[PDB]
Amino acid sequence: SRLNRESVIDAALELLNETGIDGLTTRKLAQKLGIEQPTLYWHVKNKRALLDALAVEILARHHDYSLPAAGESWQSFLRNAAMSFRRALLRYRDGAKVHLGTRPDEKQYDTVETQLRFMTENGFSLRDGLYAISAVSHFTLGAVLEQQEHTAALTDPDENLPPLLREALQIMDSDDGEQAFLHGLESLIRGFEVQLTALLQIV
Amino acid sequence: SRLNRESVIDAALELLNETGIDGLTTRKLAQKLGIEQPTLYWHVKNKRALLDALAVEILARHHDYSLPAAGESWQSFLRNAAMSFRRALLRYRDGAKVHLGTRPDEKQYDTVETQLRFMTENGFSLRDGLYAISAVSHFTLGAVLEQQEHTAALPPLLREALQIMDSDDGEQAFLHGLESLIRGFEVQLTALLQIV
Ligand SMILES: Cc1c2c(c(O)c3c(O)cccc13)C(=O)[C@]1(O)C(=O)C(C(N)=O)=C(O)[C@@H](N(C)C)[C@@H]1C2
Ligand SMILES: [Cl-]
Ligand SMILES: [Cl-]
Ligand SMILES: [Cl-]
Ligand SMILES: [Cl-]
Ligand SMILES: [Cl-]
Ligand SMILES: [Cl-]
Ligand SMILES: [Cl-]
Ligand SMILES: [Cl-]
Ligand SMILES: [Cl-]
Ligand SMILES: [Mg+2]
């Protein structure tokens, strides 16, 4: 079939959903695309190159709230961006692992620059603006990775559970992690706000 | 080698530091222990079982702040627990990845129950106490993972960002975010039913 970048990425993302990240291989991709492995090699040098491209393309295709809307508050921007990032990571099987194992594009660098510009224009020091954006990223990625790895582990004993843990596990299994995530996200943002507004005051 | 559980874990953690999580295999563990694979199999059924046990033993061995001190505030407890958790995850190569997606083990039940009960004793609902603990975990795991990954590895403002980001190992960003999280929890807890 067609082996332009877009078609190779489409096929690989579809394969990822079938195999997961550990099972994804260039050999299986060649099969999916109806080609011999040396043919694929011309287009895609190895699994690492493949994964780097997928990670970028997942965000490029699906992380559609990467920039603030005109006039949007920083609080709202971080909230929306976090929700968008989470959605994008959850869209594919092992998506967060795919994302984790890369380092950003030149395009992603521009976006981060704009986000950093935006934060600093809203009163954050560069340091605090960065730490905020980092913390949102770390929390969001951590939440998705726990969810997705937990799912992955299931494919491979209530009577002894103590009562609060039993109830906590019931609570956590009750959705895909969204409720816990959204609650933590508000706490994170409010913490940032308390810090920003303090300026040089002891807080 | 000796193949009691402790010796097997010892060997596997040593191997983990050598190979990382992806590179860790039962074949290489058997080699390290000077045994054949089917011998290892009697003791360790597969990689998932090994990883599950490593997750537990890393905390058992190195997570020293899992319970509040007598009289300790919930804020201080979460701070201390988060710092301890992070140190324990950082102790071994890919430690955060080893933890990911695990659930409390039987040997951790009393501890984790106490943590949950402790939050509720401080005014949190079980739900909100859980969400606080979970947020701390998720944030800490994210922070460590990004540190462990860019051990495994232009714009103006960004460029100074990378300077501060490379001025240390991640601890400053981590600690700053942890304080934000804790203050956010406090603001929520203290609001009760007030619009906040
Ligand atoms: C309460 C809880 C915890 C954890 C956890 O994974 C979990 C879960 O998967 C479902 C429901 C509840 C929990 C932790 O991993 C753990 O790291 C942990 O095992 C743990 C421990 N064993 O000491 C902690 O200290 C806790 N945290 C404050 C770092 C946290 C507690
Ligand atoms: Cl072609
Ligand atoms: Cl193309
Ligand atoms: Cl491959
Ligand atoms: Cl707004
Ligand atoms: Cl023995
Ligand atoms: Cl033993
Ligand atoms: Cl293996
Ligand atoms: Cl205290
Ligand atoms: Cl209780
Ligand atoms: Mg855990």
Cβ–Cβ < 8 Å for B181, A188: yes
> How many Å apart are CA B3 and CA B104, to the nearest integer?
25
> How many Å apart are CA A71 and CA B139, to the nearest integer?
29
Closest CA to B171 of B90, B65, B94: B90
Q: Which domains does chain B have, with CATH numbers?
A: 1-65 (1.10.10.60), 66-195 (1.10.357.10)
Type of residue numbered A75: Q
Q: How many CA atoms lie within 13 A of B89 on its CB side?
A: 24
Closest CA to B89 of B22, B140, B133, B134: B140
Q: Give the contacts of B166 (CB within 8 A, at least 6 positions apart).
A: none
Q: Whose CA is nearest to atom 6 of ligand 1?
A: B103
Cβ–Cβ < 8 Å for A96, A23: no
User: Could you say which of A146, A160, A164 has the minimum Cβ distance to residue B101?
Assistant: A146
Backbone region of residue A169 per phi and psi (left: phi > 0; alpha: psi in -120 to 50; beta: other values): alpha
Helices (H) then strands (E): counts for chain A:
10, 0
User: Could you say which ligand is closest to the alpha carbon of residue A44?
Assistant: 4
Type of residue numbered A31: Q
Closest CA to B55 of B92, B80, B25: B92
Cβ–Cβ < 8 Å for A61, A50: no
CA A119 to chain centroid: 20
Q: Which of A47, A134, A171, A202 is the best substitution to test chain B (most B C-beta atoms within 10 A)?
A: A134
Beta-carbon separation of A184 and B138 below 8 A:
yes
Neighbours of ion ligand 2 (CB under 5 A): A 2-3
Task: Ligand 1: list residues with CB < 6 Å.
Answer: A 168-169, 172; B 59, 63, 66, 81, 85, 103-104, 108, 111-112, 115-116, 133, 136-137
> How many Å apart are CA B84 and CA B145, to the nearest integer?
15
Tell me the resolution in Å.
Answer: 1.8
Closest CA to A138 of B175, B131, B21, B129: B175
- Whose tokens are 């992690």? That residue is A177
